[PDB]
Amino acid sequence: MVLESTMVCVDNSEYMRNGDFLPTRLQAQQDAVNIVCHSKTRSNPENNVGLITLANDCEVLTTLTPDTGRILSKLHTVQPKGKITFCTGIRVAHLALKHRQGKNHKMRIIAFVGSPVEDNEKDLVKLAKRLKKEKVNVDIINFGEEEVNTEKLTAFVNTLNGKDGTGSHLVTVPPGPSLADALISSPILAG
Amino acid sequence: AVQKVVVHPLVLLSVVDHFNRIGKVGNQKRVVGVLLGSWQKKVLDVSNSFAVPFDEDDKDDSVWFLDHDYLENMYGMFKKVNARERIVGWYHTGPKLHKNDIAINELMKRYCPNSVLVIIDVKPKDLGLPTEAYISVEEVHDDGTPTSKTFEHVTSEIGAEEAEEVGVEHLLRDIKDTTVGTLSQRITNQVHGLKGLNSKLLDIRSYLEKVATGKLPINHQIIYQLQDVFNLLPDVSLQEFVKAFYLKTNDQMVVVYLASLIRSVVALHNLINNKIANRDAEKKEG
Amino acid sequence: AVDTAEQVYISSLALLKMLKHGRAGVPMEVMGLMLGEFVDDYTVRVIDVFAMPQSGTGVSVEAVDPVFQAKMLDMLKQTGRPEMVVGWYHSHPGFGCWLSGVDINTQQSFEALSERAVAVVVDPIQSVKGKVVIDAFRLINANMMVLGHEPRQTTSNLGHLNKPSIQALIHGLNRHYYSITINYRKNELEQKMLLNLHKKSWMEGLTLQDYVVKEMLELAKNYNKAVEEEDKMTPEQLAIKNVGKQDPKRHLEEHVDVLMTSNIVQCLAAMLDTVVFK
Amino acid sequence: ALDMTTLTIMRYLPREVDPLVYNMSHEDPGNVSYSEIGGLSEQIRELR
Ligand SMILES: [Zn+2]
C-alpha cells in the first residue's frame, strides 16, 4: 500500500467547453480524474486526492482526502469560463502538497491544459527549477487544445525533471478527438 | 449591513494567543482565523473563534491556501457547542491590509452571506481600539471608478464579559473621578492634538503624495465632504465661534462665574472643617 | 513519591473560556477537558482549555467523547502545538467549589490516564473582576493516607497555600482529596492588550472625543449645595454643643470633594472652548 | 420571562387562563332572534 497524495489541477475554460475529446472535454477530464483516483485507491486506501481549476482562480476545489466522493462532487458543476493561469496554479499546487500534514505520503501533481498560457518561458522555467528543488513529481496531460507543441511546458518539464530526473511524461493533446482511455494509458504506463 | 461590529474580549485575546502559538515562525507576519459570531440584529457580535491554517506569499499574493476540512470540521464541532455561534467573518493581523485580502474575502463571502474582516492587531499601540472592521462589496461608483470593489470600514466595539479582568486588571485599575480632568484632558490633547493632526497631515501630504502614490487628492468624496463636515466651524480668521462676544463669550462668563462662586463657598466649608480638625482636636494636651 | 504545595498556572485564555462555557451551561453543569502542560511536578501550567460538546450523561467519565478528543487534538496538531490534557474542568453551580463521589470516579480515570489529573470547579457566583470562585482539587489515595499526604520542602509556598484554607462545604467532602493552589499564569502582552482595552475600551476612553457638561450641571450643583446647607446644620450643632460626653454629630457630610471635582472639570471645558478648537 | 440563573427580565409575554375572569368577561351569550317569546310591545319600544 504505497502512500501517495496527489494535488491534481483541473481546468475550467471556454476551451474546456469544446467537446472534441469524448462528448465534452470537461467530461473527459472528469473521467481522467476518476481513473487516477481509482488507481490511487487501488495502490493505497489512505492515498489522498485533491483538485482545483488552474484557470482564472487557483484556490483549492477540494482538500486532499482518502475518500474519492468529495473529488467526484467537485468535478460536478465545475463550470468552465476562466482564462488559464497555470503559473499561479502550479505554485499553489506544490505548496499545497507541503501544506498537507501527512507529508510522508509521496507528493505528485497531475494537471490538464486546455488553452495556451501567456507567460514568459523563463518565468515558468524558474518555477520549474524551484519545483525540482522541491522534488515533487509533476505530469501534465494537455486536453483538447494547448500552446502548439506545449514548447514552454516541454522546457518546464525538462527543467522540472533534468539531470536524469523522473522525466514524468507530458502528454500534448492528441490532435482532434482523443479517447479518454488513450489519455489514461500514458500515465498508467509511466509517470 | 454590518451596522456595528462588537468583538467579545475572549476573541480579542484569542487572536493574540494564536500569534504566540505561531510565534515560532515569524515568516507569516500575520495571524489568520475563522471569526465566529451571532447576527442577532444589525449589530454583529463576534464570539468564540478558531484559527484556520493559512499561508500568505509575497509572490503576487496569489499563493494563498485555506483548509476546507479545518474550516468545516472545527466550525461544525464549535456550532455543536453553541447553536447561536455561526460563521460571521474572518480575523487577520498584519495591520497594513495585504492585496491578497480581497481574494481571501471572496472565499469568506462564499462561506457566510454577509461576512466581515476584522484586522485585530496582536501588538496594541495607542488611540482608538485594536480591531479594525472591513466589509468587501462589489458596486458601481456613482462618479465612475472602474470595478469599485473594495473593503468598507464599519464601526467596531468591545464585547461584555464577567470575571475576565480578575486575571489582568486586578493588578492595576483606576475606577474613580479623582483622575478625571487631572490626566483625562491630557490624553485627549495628546491624541486629538497629535493623532487627529496626523490623519489630516496624511491628507495634506496627500495633496502632493496622493498625486504621487495616493489614489487621488481629489478622490473619495468624503476626503473633501467629511473634511468640510469637520469644518462645520469655518477654521480661520473671523470664525464667529468663540469670537461671538454677546453669544458664546457672555455665556462662558455666566457659567464660569456660577461654577466659580461655588468655589468661594466650597473653600469656606473645607477651611472651617480643617480649623476644627487641627485647632481643636490636635490641641488636646490633657 | 511525595506530594508538595504544587502551583497550577491558569492561562488567561483557559480561564476566560471556562467561565464563558460554564455560564452557558450553568443550569446543566457543563463539563470540558483542560489542555494543561505537565512541565514538572512542582509547576503545572494550563496553556489552553477546550469545551466538550454538551453531553447528556453529565460530568461523568462516560460523557467525555473519545472521538471528539482525538479529532480536536488533530486540529491542535495542525494549527499551533497541542498539549496532553492535564485533567477534566467542569462547573458545579449549586456549590461554588465542591467534590463528589461521581466526580472522584471520573478523577480516578484521569489519574489512571496521567498523574496530576487536576480538576477545576468554576460556578455562576461571580464578580466583575474579583470573584475567582473557581478552585482546583486533586484526590489523595487511601493507601497514601498512612504516609504524609503533602510533605513540604518550602514553608512560604505552604503559607500561600494556607491563605485559601478550606471551604465549609469542601470540608464536608475534603477527605480523600487535597486542595491544590491555583495562580494566574504569567500574562504580559496578554495583560497589556486587556490593559490597553480597559480604560481606553472597557471603561470610556474615546480619547479623540473622551472629554450634560453645561446643561444639567446647574441643577446638580444647586441640589448638592442645598443638601450641604441642610447637612451643615449638624456641624453647627456640634460647635454649639458642649459635648462634654462624646456623641455622634453627623459631621463629615463632605460633598465638598464632589462639588470641587464637578465644578473644576466643567471649568476645564475652557480648554475645549479656546485651545482644542481655535 | 425571568432568566433561570440570571433572574433578570427576558421578554414581555401576556398569557392567563383566567377561568373565573372568563365568567366575568364575555361568557354571556346573545339571543339572535328578535322575538323568541314575542311580547316586544315595550321591549323593542320603551327599552330600545
Ligand atoms: Zn466534578
Side-chain angles (χ1 to χ4, degrees):
Chain A
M1 299 303 185
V2 43
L3 314 167
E4 52 220 357
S5 294
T6 299
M7 189 53 180
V8 6
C9 288
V10 294
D11 183 21
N12 68 10
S13 67
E14 49 165 358
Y15 287 71
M16 296 297 305
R17 298 189 304 102
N18 131 281
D20 72 328
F21 283 20
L22 277 317
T24 315
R25 202 194 290 187
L26 294 141
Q27 168 258 358
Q29 181 185 243
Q30 159 245 341
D31 295 344
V33 177
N34 297 161
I35 83 98
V36 303
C37 87
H38 293 141
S39 174
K40 292 308 175 179
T41 305
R42 301 313 170 269
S43 305
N44 169 51
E46 322 166 19
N47 284 349
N48 284 13
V49 180
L51 54 98
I52 172 62
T53 168
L54 36 76
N56 187 26
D57 188 15
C58 307
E59 36 123 11
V60 188
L61 209 43
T62 154
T63 304
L64 290 95
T65 157
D67 182 33
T68 181
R70 205 189 307 176
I71 283 89
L72 305 175
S73 69
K74 293 309 164 297
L75 291 168
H76 307 327
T77 193
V78 54
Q79 172 56 229
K81 48 183 181 60
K83 185 57 187 178
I84 176 182
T85 45
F86 124 91
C87 143
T88 54
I90 243 54
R91 187 117 306 268
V92 155
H94 245 254
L95 203 42
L97 246 20
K98 270 160 288 301
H99 266 67
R100 312 172 301 103
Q101 40 198 14
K103 276 164 291 299
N104 300 356
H105 272 62
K106 303 306 173 180
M107 328 229 282
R108 184 176 297 268
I109 296 168
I110 160 189
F112 312 96
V113 164
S115 352
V117 40
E118 292 78 26
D119 183 32
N120 182 20
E121 52 178 3
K122 304 171 55 63
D123 298 358
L124 44 101
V125 153
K126 283 187 290 288
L127 302 185
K129 79 192 55 175
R130 174 54 196 167
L131 302 200
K132 159 171 287 302
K133 312 302 157 49
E134 281 148 334
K135 216 174 56 180
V136 166
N137 296 165
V138 178
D139 22 270
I140 306 187
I141 318 175
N142 312 135
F143 254 67
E145 194 159 346
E146 83 283 51
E147 25 149 345
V148 41
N149 289 167
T150 7
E151 182 268 337
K152 301 191 303 290
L153 252 63
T154 304
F156 167 90
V157 162
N158 186 29
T159 316
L160 222 163
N161 299 134
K163 296 295 297 178
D164 202 8
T166 311
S168 307
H169 285 67
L170 167 76
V171 186
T172 77
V173 348
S178 173
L179 303 176
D181 293 353
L183 295 151
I184 82 179
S185 180
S186 177
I188 296 177
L189 184 66
Chain B
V2 206
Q3 190 182 0
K4 27 249 182 300
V5 194
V6 192
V7 180
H8 259 116
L10 310 323
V11 213
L12 215 162
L13 152 127
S14 183
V15 189
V16 94
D17 73 49
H18 186 233
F19 200 84
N20 197 22
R21 259 286 201 96
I22 73 145
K24 38 178 182 177
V25 37
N27 304 350
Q28 188 67 207
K29 102 187 180 183
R30 53 183 45 97
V31 131
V32 162
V34 186
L35 182 107
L36 312 177
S38 162
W39 199 282
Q40 192 168 357
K41 200 50 185 180
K42 293 213 60 60
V43 40
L44 186 152
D45 199 352
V46 184
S47 304
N48 186 19
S49 296
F50 63 91
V52 51
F54 164 80
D55 269 10
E56 211 285 294
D57 202 3
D58 65 311
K59 307 300 174 183
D60 207 18
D61 58 80
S62 306
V63 210
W64 64 280
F65 315 78
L66 278 180
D67 183 16
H68 294 211
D69 182 75
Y70 188 100
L71 209 147
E72 268 67 278
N73 296 9
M74 206 117 164
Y75 168 54
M77 288 170 151
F78 272 37
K79 196 166 190 175
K80 182 161 36 179
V81 337
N82 189 18
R84 201 47 58 187
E85 197 73 272
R86 42 184 167 266
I87 40 194
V88 94
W90 71 297
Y91 60 84
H92 96 114
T93 316
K96 150 67 188 154
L97 72 102
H98 50 282
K99 179 188 164 186
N100 204 345
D101 268 312
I102 208 138
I104 310 162
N105 135 83
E106 303 298 329
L107 188 141
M108 126 215 162
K109 286 173 74 67
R110 115 194 152 181
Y111 280 133
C112 172
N114 40 17
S115 19
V116 71
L117 161 61
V118 166
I119 319 196
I120 151 77
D121 194 3
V122 298
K123 312 154 299 297
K125 310 135 298 299
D126 183 33
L127 174 81
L129 83 153
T131 66
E132 206 284 341
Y134 272 151
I135 155 76
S136 178
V137 275
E138 297 84 14
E139 72 268 357
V140 183
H141 198 268
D142 174 50
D143 202 22
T145 78
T147 306
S148 188
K149 173 209 305 108
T150 24
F151 290 91
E152 308 298 329
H153 167 74
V154 263
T155 320
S156 191
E157 292 91 2
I158 314 296
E161 197 60 28
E162 75 291 326
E164 72 304 317
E165 262 119 64
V166 51
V168 159
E169 276 301 313
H170 71 129
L171 294 185
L172 45 141
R173 306 153 302 177
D174 203 297
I175 172 168
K176 30 246 188 54
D177 65 326
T178 310
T179 57
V180 170
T182 315
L183 42 87
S184 190
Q185 87 281 24
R186 190 166 279 98
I187 339 176
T188 94
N189 288 16
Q190 177 188 352
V191 284
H192 103 275
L194 208 147
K195 296 295 202 308
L197 145 76
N198 187 32
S199 264
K200 182 37 66 183
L201 182 139
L202 250 48
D203 265 7
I204 88 108
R205 216 53 59 186
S206 106
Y207 301 153
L208 188 57
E209 160 259 307
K210 227 77 181 308
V211 149
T213 56
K215 218 108 274 78
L216 228 265
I218 310 291
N219 210 348
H220 321 115
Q221 184 71 214
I222 47 192
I223 289 196
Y224 13 97
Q225 180 193 10
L226 214 32
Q227 159 191 342
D228 296 335
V229 169
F230 167 69
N231 308 344
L232 193 269
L233 15 104
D235 291 352
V236 85
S237 305
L238 260 300
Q239 200 77 215
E240 310 104 21
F241 264 53
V242 225
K243 298 83 196 170
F245 275 31
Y246 32 82
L247 214 37
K248 175 67 177 54
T249 316
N250 215 359
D251 168 54
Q252 178 183 178
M253 142 267 150
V254 181
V255 177
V256 151
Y257 267 4
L258 291 187
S260 292
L261 278 218
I262 321 150
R263 332 296 284 105
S264 65
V265 205
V266 168
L268 204 185
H269 322 125
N270 216 14
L271 300 184
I272 319 308
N273 295 352
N274 183 35
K275 291 182 174 67
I276 285 297
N278 155 66
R279 310 190 316 177
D280 234 358
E282 172 258 8
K283 188 188 170 60
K284 279 308 164 184
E285 66 280 339
Chain C
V2 286
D3 300 356
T4 34
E6 301 115 0
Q7 203 68 30
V8 186
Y9 299 73
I10 40 185
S11 66
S12 179
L13 49 145
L15 168 71
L16 298 182
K17 266 52 183 179
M18 288 182 41
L19 46 97
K20 174 180 49 183
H21 146 267
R23 193 67 183 182
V26 156
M28 57 157 55
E29 42 274 350
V30 277
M31 75 98 50
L33 249 296
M34 177 172 31
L35 212 75
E37 173 196 2
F38 299 90
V39 29
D40 47 47
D41 186 36
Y42 34 104
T43 74
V44 33
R45 25 191 55 95
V46 29
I47 149 170
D48 189 28
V49 122
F50 71 95
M52 292 302 296
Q54 294 81 23
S55 301
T57 338
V59 293
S60 69
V61 43
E62 293 85 14
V64 183
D65 186 39
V67 0
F68 185 86
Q69 295 281 323
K71 208 163 301 299
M72 189 61 179
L73 274 173
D74 193 25
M75 292 151 186
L76 295 164
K77 301 171 200 311
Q78 50 184 326
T79 305
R81 187 71 60 177
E83 28 272 341
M84 167 62 177
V85 273
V86 283
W88 64 307
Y89 88 84
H90 64 287
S91 57
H92 288 298
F95 332 89
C97 41
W98 97 303
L99 289 147
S100 177
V102 180
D103 298 343
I104 208 185
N105 299 151
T106 127
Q107 174 85 340
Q108 167 261 350
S109 308
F110 285 99
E111 179 196 22
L113 179 63
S114 199
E115 179 253 347
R116 243 147 290 168
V118 189
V120 213
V121 192
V122 65
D123 123 298
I125 314 170
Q126 287 301 350
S127 164
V128 50
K129 42 191 173 181
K131 184 56 204 182
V132 218
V133 73
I134 127 189
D135 201 358
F137 310 106
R138 168 53 157 93
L139 93 122
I140 192 62
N141 305 351
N143 294 158
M144 288 193 63
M145 100 185 300
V146 188
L147 185 67
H149 318 277
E150 277 82 53
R152 225 73 58 172
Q153 193 248 168
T154 53
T155 351
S156 202
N157 93 336
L158 173 53
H160 305 137
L161 171 68
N162 216 9
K163 293 167 175 61
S165 191
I166 222 64
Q167 313 304 126
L169 215 149
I170 262 298
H171 152 260
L173 301 105
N174 193 33
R175 184 188 52 179
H176 300 119
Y177 311 91
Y178 74 90
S179 178
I180 185 169
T181 4
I182 0 94
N183 77 310
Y184 317 113
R185 116 115 179 264
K186 312 134 295 299
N187 305 313
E188 219 290 326
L189 210 161
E190 185 284 311
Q191 167 124 180
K192 181 162 54 68
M193 61 157 31
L194 282 190
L195 160 146
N196 201 8
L197 273 359
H198 175 249
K199 297 208 66 180
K200 182 96 56 181
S201 117
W202 268 76
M203 200 51 184
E204 189 224 1
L206 210 27
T207 65
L208 239 29
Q209 342 182 47
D210 217 19
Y211 231 45
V212 176
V213 193
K214 273 81 56 181
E215 285 79 1
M216 56 152 291
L217 234 280
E218 290 87 13
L219 294 181
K221 72 186 55 179
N222 293 335
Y223 297 158
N224 199 18
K225 165 182 50 254
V227 167
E228 280 187 1
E229 197 255 355
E230 308 294 333
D231 280 6
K232 70 124 284 91
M233 171 264 308
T234 62
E236 166 76 6
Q237 285 285 150
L238 168 64
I240 76 186
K241 191 78 267 178
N242 65 322
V243 73
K245 176 58 197 62
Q246 183 182 359
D247 289 313
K249 269 295 182 178
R250 304 287 80 253
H251 213 136
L252 301 173
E253 79 287 343
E254 230 285 318
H255 301 322
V256 172
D257 292 350
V258 180
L259 261 180
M260 280 248 300
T261 56
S262 66
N263 312 330
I264 266 187
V265 169
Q266 172 201 38
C267 195
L268 250 288
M271 301 312 293
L272 304 169
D273 293 337
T274 57
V275 163
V276 162
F277 148 71
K278 272 299 288 187
Chain D
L2 301 172
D3 206 351
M4 179 184 173
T5 64
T6 326
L7 246 312
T8 46
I9 318 183
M10 295 280 108
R11 261 158 280 99
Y12 52 100
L13 9 128
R15 234 290 89 189
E16 292 84 21
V17 277
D18 285 348
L20 279 323
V21 182
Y22 281 179
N23 306 145
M24 316 163 189
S25 292
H26 249 331
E27 191 81 20
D28 177 54
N31 292 348
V32 283
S33 172
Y34 73 108
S35 54
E36 184 66 29
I37 49 102
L40 299 180
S41 59
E42 302 287 353
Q43 278 67 16
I44 311 291
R45 184 164 47 181
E46 169 189 354
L47 175 58
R48 165 180 293 267

mmCIF file of all heavy atoms in Angstrom, chain C residues 31 59-60 88-92 98-100 102-104 106-107 119-121, ligand 1:
data_model
loop_
_atom_site.group_PDB
_atom_site.id
_atom_site.type_symbol
_atom_site.label_atom_id
_atom_site.label_comp_id
_atom_site.label_asym_id
_atom_site.label_seq_id
_atom_site.Cartn_x
_atom_site.Cartn_y
_atom_site.Cartn_z
ATOM 1 N N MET C 31 -19.398 20.224 31.279
ATOM 2 C CA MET C 31 -18.021 19.768 31.605
ATOM 3 C C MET C 31 -17.126 19.938 30.376
ATOM 4 O O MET C 31 -17.672 20.072 29.264
ATOM 5 C CB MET C 31 -18.002 18.306 32.066
ATOM 6 C CG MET C 31 -18.176 17.292 30.952
ATOM 7 S SD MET C 31 -16.592 16.616 30.391
ATOM 8 C CE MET C 31 -15.864 16.150 31.960
ATOM 9 N N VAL C 59 -21.281 15.170 34.011
ATOM 10 C CA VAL C 59 -19.828 15.461 34.190
ATOM 11 C C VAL C 59 -19.101 14.120 34.313
ATOM 12 O O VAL C 59 -17.884 14.133 34.570
ATOM 13 C CB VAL C 59 -19.592 16.339 35.433
ATOM 14 C CG1 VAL C 59 -20.167 17.735 35.257
ATOM 15 C CG2 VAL C 59 -20.139 15.691 36.696
ATOM 16 N N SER C 60 -19.815 13.007 34.119
ATOM 17 C CA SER C 60 -19.229 11.653 34.305
ATOM 18 C C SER C 60 -18.195 11.325 33.224
ATOM 19 O O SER C 60 -18.214 11.978 32.165
ATOM 20 C CB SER C 60 -20.314 10.613 34.327
ATOM 21 O OG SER C 60 -20.909 10.485 33.045
ATOM 22 N N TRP C 88 -9.815 17.004 33.818
ATOM 23 C CA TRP C 88 -11.160 17.482 33.405
ATOM 24 C C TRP C 88 -11.530 18.776 34.135
ATOM 25 O O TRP C 88 -11.333 18.839 35.359
ATOM 26 C CB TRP C 88 -12.203 16.384 33.644
ATOM 27 C CG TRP C 88 -12.402 15.997 35.077
ATOM 28 C CD1 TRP C 88 -11.448 15.618 35.977
ATOM 29 C CD2 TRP C 88 -13.656 15.926 35.774
ATOM 30 N NE1 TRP C 88 -12.021 15.334 37.187
ATOM 31 C CE2 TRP C 88 -13.374 15.515 37.093
ATOM 32 C CE3 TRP C 88 -14.984 16.172 35.416
ATOM 33 C CZ2 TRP C 88 -14.374 15.346 38.048
ATOM 34 C CZ3 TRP C 88 -15.972 16.005 36.360
ATOM 35 C CH2 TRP C 88 -15.668 15.596 37.657
ATOM 36 N N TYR C 89 -12.029 19.775 33.405
ATOM 37 C CA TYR C 89 -12.505 21.022 34.056
ATOM 38 C C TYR C 89 -14.028 21.041 33.921
ATOM 39 O O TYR C 89 -14.531 20.662 32.857
ATOM 40 C CB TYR C 89 -11.846 22.260 33.442
ATOM 41 C CG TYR C 89 -12.549 22.835 32.237
ATOM 42 C CD1 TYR C 89 -13.616 23.707 32.373
ATOM 43 C CD2 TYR C 89 -12.140 22.513 30.956
ATOM 44 C CE1 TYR C 89 -14.273 24.227 31.272
ATOM 45 C CE2 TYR C 89 -12.779 23.032 29.842
ATOM 46 C CZ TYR C 89 -13.849 23.892 30.000
ATOM 47 O OH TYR C 89 -14.481 24.407 28.906
ATOM 48 N N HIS C 90 -14.746 21.430 34.972
ATOM 49 C CA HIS C 90 -16.227 21.347 34.897
ATOM 50 C C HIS C 90 -16.868 22.325 35.879
ATOM 51 O O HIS C 90 -16.142 22.875 36.717
ATOM 52 C CB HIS C 90 -16.667 19.914 35.164
ATOM 53 C CG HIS C 90 -16.318 19.482 36.538
ATOM 54 N ND1 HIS C 90 -15.026 19.200 36.927
ATOM 55 C CD2 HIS C 90 -17.090 19.332 37.624
ATOM 56 C CE1 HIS C 90 -15.025 18.869 38.199
ATOM 57 N NE2 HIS C 90 -16.290 18.900 38.635
ATOM 58 N N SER C 91 -18.178 22.543 35.763
ATOM 59 C CA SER C 91 -18.827 23.569 36.618
ATOM 60 C C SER C 91 -19.873 22.953 37.546
ATOM 61 O O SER C 91 -20.728 22.206 37.042
ATOM 62 C CB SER C 91 -19.448 24.639 35.761
ATOM 63 O OG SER C 91 -20.378 24.076 34.846
ATOM 64 N N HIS C 92 -19.796 23.235 38.850
ATOM 65 C CA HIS C 92 -20.880 22.786 39.764
ATOM 66 C C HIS C 92 -21.605 24.045 40.239
ATOM 67 O O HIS C 92 -21.078 24.723 41.139
ATOM 68 C CB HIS C 92 -20.330 21.945 40.923
ATOM 69 C CG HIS C 92 -19.866 20.583 40.525
ATOM 70 N ND1 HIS C 92 -20.713 19.639 39.980
ATOM 71 C CD2 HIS C 92 -18.656 19.991 40.624
ATOM 72 C CE1 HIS C 92 -20.039 18.532 39.738
ATOM 73 N NE2 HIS C 92 -18.772 18.722 40.124
ATOM 74 N N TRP C 98 -16.733 22.290 44.953
ATOM 75 C CA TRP C 98 -17.040 21.110 45.804
ATOM 76 C C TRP C 98 -16.566 19.833 45.105
ATOM 77 O O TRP C 98 -16.265 19.900 43.897
ATOM 78 C CB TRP C 98 -18.532 21.067 46.167
ATOM 79 C CG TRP C 98 -19.368 20.187 45.292
ATOM 80 C CD1 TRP C 98 -19.516 20.261 43.938
ATOM 81 C CD2 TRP C 98 -20.204 19.101 45.726
ATOM 82 N NE1 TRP C 98 -20.369 19.285 43.498
ATOM 83 C CE2 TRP C 98 -20.809 18.560 44.572
ATOM 84 C CE3 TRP C 98 -20.496 18.535 46.970
ATOM 85 C CZ2 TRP C 98 -21.692 17.483 44.633
ATOM 86 C CZ3 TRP C 98 -21.363 17.467 47.028
ATOM 87 C CH2 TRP C 98 -21.951 16.950 45.875
ATOM 88 N N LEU C 99 -16.481 18.726 45.844
ATOM 89 C CA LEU C 99 -16.058 17.433 45.251
ATOM 90 C C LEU C 99 -17.151 16.396 45.509
ATOM 91 O O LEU C 99 -17.805 16.486 46.562
ATOM 92 C CB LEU C 99 -14.731 17.017 45.885
ATOM 93 C CG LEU C 99 -13.537 17.860 45.447
ATOM 94 C CD1 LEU C 99 -12.524 17.999 46.569
ATOM 95 C CD2 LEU C 99 -12.902 17.282 44.192
ATOM 96 N N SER C 100 -17.349 15.463 44.576
ATOM 97 C CA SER C 100 -18.444 14.468 44.709
ATOM 98 C C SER C 100 -17.908 13.064 44.435
ATOM 99 O O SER C 100 -16.830 12.956 43.826
ATOM 100 C CB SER C 100 -19.578 14.798 43.779
ATOM 101 O OG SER C 100 -20.594 13.808 43.845
ATOM 102 N N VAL C 102 -19.263 11.007 42.426
ATOM 103 C CA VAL C 102 -19.323 10.913 40.940
ATOM 104 C C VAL C 102 -18.065 11.593 40.398
ATOM 105 O O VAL C 102 -17.426 11.019 39.500
ATOM 106 C CB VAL C 102 -20.592 11.594 40.398
ATOM 107 C CG1 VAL C 102 -20.674 11.520 38.881
ATOM 108 C CG2 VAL C 102 -21.851 11.025 41.033
ATOM 109 N N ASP C 103 -17.701 12.741 40.974
ATOM 110 C CA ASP C 103 -16.514 13.488 40.487
ATOM 111 C C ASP C 103 -15.271 12.614 40.675
ATOM 112 O O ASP C 103 -14.454 12.555 39.741
ATOM 113 C CB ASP C 103 -16.351 14.823 41.216
ATOM 114 C CG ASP C 103 -17.518 15.769 41.017
ATOM 115 O OD1 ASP C 103 -18.299 15.549 40.071
ATOM 116 O OD2 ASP C 103 -17.641 16.713 41.820
ATOM 117 N N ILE C 104 -15.152 11.938 41.822
ATOM 118 C CA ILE C 104 -13.916 11.145 42.086
ATOM 119 C C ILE C 104 -13.818 10.029 41.045
ATOM 120 O O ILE C 104 -12.693 9.719 40.631
ATOM 121 C CB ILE C 104 -13.799 10.639 43.542
ATOM 122 C CG1 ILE C 104 -12.334 10.469 43.953
ATOM 123 C CG2 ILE C 104 -14.586 9.362 43.782
ATOM 124 C CD1 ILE C 104 -12.149 9.853 45.321
ATOM 125 N N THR C 106 -14.667 9.937 37.894
ATOM 126 C CA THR C 106 -14.017 10.492 36.676
ATOM 127 C C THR C 106 -12.573 10.878 37.005
ATOM 128 O O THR C 106 -11.689 10.598 36.179
ATOM 129 C CB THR C 106 -14.822 11.634 36.042
ATOM 130 O OG1 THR C 106 -13.950 12.753 35.895
ATOM 131 C CG2 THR C 106 -16.052 12.020 36.832
ATOM 132 N N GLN C 107 -12.348 11.463 38.182
ATOM 133 C CA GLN C 107 -10.989 11.932 38.551
ATOM 134 C C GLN C 107 -10.051 10.728 38.586
ATOM 135 O O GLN C 107 -8.910 10.861 38.121
ATOM 136 C CB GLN C 107 -11.038 12.627 39.912
ATOM 137 C CG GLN C 107 -9.679 13.031 40.464
ATOM 138 C CD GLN C 107 -9.204 14.371 39.960
ATOM 139 O OE1 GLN C 107 -9.658 14.869 38.934
ATOM 140 N NE2 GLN C 107 -8.273 14.965 40.686
ATOM 141 N N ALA C 119 -8.510 18.905 38.670
ATOM 142 C CA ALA C 119 -9.947 19.115 38.380
ATOM 143 C C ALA C 119 -10.351 20.524 38.820
ATOM 144 O O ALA C 119 -10.027 20.889 39.962
ATOM 145 C CB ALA C 119 -10.775 18.067 39.077
ATOM 146 N N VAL C 120 -11.045 21.276 37.958
ATOM 147 C CA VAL C 120 -11.401 22.690 38.288
ATOM 148 C C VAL C 120 -12.921 22.798 38.433
ATOM 149 O O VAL C 120 -13.623 22.068 37.713
ATOM 150 C CB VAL C 120 -10.860 23.678 37.240
ATOM 151 C CG1 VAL C 120 -10.490 25.005 37.878
ATOM 152 C CG2 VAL C 120 -9.664 23.107 36.501
ATOM 153 N N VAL C 121 -13.400 23.643 39.354
ATOM 154 C CA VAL C 121 -14.866 23.752 39.614
ATOM 155 C C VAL C 121 -15.294 25.223 39.556
ATOM 156 O O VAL C 121 -15.445 25.835 40.631
ATOM 157 C CB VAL C 121 -15.259 23.105 40.957
ATOM 158 C CG1 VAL C 121 -16.766 22.965 41.087
ATOM 159 C CG2 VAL C 121 -14.592 21.754 41.162
HETATM 160 ZN ZN ZN E 1 -16.844 17.041 39.198
#
